[PDB]
Design a protein around this ligand. Structure first.
Ligand SMILES: *[C@@H]1O[C@H](CO)[C@@H](O)[C@H](O)[C@H]1NC(C)=O
Length: 203
């Protein structure tokens, strides 16, 4: 499907964004998400068109979190050093906290020396988010960012496309959605290509 391999021709590191949605158990503050992602709340608010940094986020509200993304071998990642809180697994952390922007596998692959369930509260575990950075061909098109977005079984391209202000075809071809198996109930990361940061709806 979508290849998350380091472009051979374009720089190894870059700035893009990953998509995160407000979650009603705990992540309904900017503070929640900034602590989850190690960035300032204003950077998120600026990237998400939020004009008041103190307003609560409504459940499911779309947000763009700026991340800096680099090469770790032949694949692109953006690592977040997350400190362990009480009762957190790799699986929990990566399917609810980080909202499937990373799978348990790659996490415990770049976090050796550890027991995936005996995590002592207060240890640094690096959470490699998925991200790609513009190939040379991306940049010659005018693409400024490949935003990470977690495709679920429920999304349809027209809604997401109008949300990010792109064509359906842009999404479909960037992710080779023309022979891609949505049968699998899996969630998988994809890349929205955008010529500029989009002007997200107000709530
Ligand atoms: C898909 O998005 C379009 C955009 O307007 C909408 O009309 C439609 O109801 C959505 N759902 C589908 C096609 O299942």
């Amino acid at each position: 499907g979508t290849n998350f391999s380091c472009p051979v021709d374009s720089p190894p590191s870059c700035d893009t964004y990953v998509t995160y949605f407000a979650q009603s158990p705990n992540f309904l503050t900017l503070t929640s998400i900034s602590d989850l992602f190690d960035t300032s709340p204003l950077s998120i608010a600026r990237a998400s068109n939020i004009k008041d940094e103190n307003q609560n986020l409504v459940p499911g509200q779309l947000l763009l979190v700026p991340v800096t993304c680099a090469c770790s071998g032949s694949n692109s990642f953006s690592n977040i050093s997350h400190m362990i809180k009480e009762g957190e697994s790799y699986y929990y952390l990566s399917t609810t906290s980080y909202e499937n922007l990373t799978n348990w596998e790659t996490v415990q692959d770049s976090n050796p020396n550890y027991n995936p369930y005996l995590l002592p509260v207060g240890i640094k575990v690096v959470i490699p988010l998925f991200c790609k950075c513009p190939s040379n061909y991306h940049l010659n098109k005018g693409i400024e960012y490949l935003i990470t977005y977690v495709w679920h079984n429920n999304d349809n391209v027209s809604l997401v496309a109008s949300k990010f202000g792109v064509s359906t075809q842009d999404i479909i071809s960037e992710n080779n959605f023309s022979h891609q198996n949505f049968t699998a109930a899996t969630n998988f990361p994809i890349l929205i290509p955008v010529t500029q940061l989009p002007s997200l709806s107000q709530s």
